């Protein structure tokens, strides 16, 4: 708020001003990965791939 010094303050009455900011979001962070069925690694590695993704 402002502040004025004096006794007579005719036509010196101020208004009110309140400022604001905006918060937003970007884009998702993904871990798209495929799982070939005909490969031995299909169950050997996908769990730990999930953990490494986290």
């Amino acid at each position: 708020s402002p502040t004025q010094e004096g006794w007579d303050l005719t036509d010196k009455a101020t208004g009110l001003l309140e400022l604001n900011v905006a918060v937003n979001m970007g884009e998702p962070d993904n871990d798209f990965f495929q799982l070939r069925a005909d490969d031995l690694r299909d169950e050997t590695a996908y769990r730990r791939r999930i953990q490494s993704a986290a």
């Binding site: 069925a37 005909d38 490969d39 031995l40 299909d42 169950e43 050997t44 769990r47």
Partner: protein
């Protein structure tokens, strides 16, 4: 080996048939040699069924390089006898001949020996079916949580 060209294979086949050789007072015409080279190319192409037949290392000539004769056949030292014996058998009818029993037997034996190692290589077993369990004995499979074989 002294047989390093398609023309050399044709000459060996003609020598085996008894038609033309280094010692004969008469020789075959260059047109006949070209026709025999064409017959050899046709036979080799029929054998090598675009990679699904008899693998021999035969190198097919191209039209850009004019003379088919003079190209190295690329065959290994163990296939030359079979190739030229079957070539003699194939080009026998041109001269109203008939390949003799020994030549026919050698051609059959050579073709069998040509396909022997390729057949050994292709005799492969298919993997486990898609519905076959891995079993509890395979502790790696049990701990990695794949209880059934992938297949295909």
């Amino acid at each position: 080996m002294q047989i390093k060209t398609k023309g050399d294979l044709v000459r060996a086949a003609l020598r085996k048939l008894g038609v033309a050789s280094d010692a004969t007072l008469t020789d075959v015409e260059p047109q006949s040699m070209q026709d025999a080279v064409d017959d050899l190319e046709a036979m080799m192409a029929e054998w090598y069924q675009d990679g699904k037949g008899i693998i021999t290392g035969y190198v097919f000539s191209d039209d850009e390089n004019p003379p088919a004769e003079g190209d190295d056949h690329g065959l290994r030292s163990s296939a030359v006898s079979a190739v030229f014996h079957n070539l003699a058998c194939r080009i026998a009818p041109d001269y109203a001949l008939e390949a003799t029993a020994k030549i026919i037997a050698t051609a059959k034996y050579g073709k069998e020996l040509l396909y022997k190692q390729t057949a050994i290589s292709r005799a492969k077993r298919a993997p486990y079916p898609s519905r076959m369990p891995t079993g509890s004995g395979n502790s790696f499979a049990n701990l990695n949580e794949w209880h059934y074989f992938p297949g295909e």
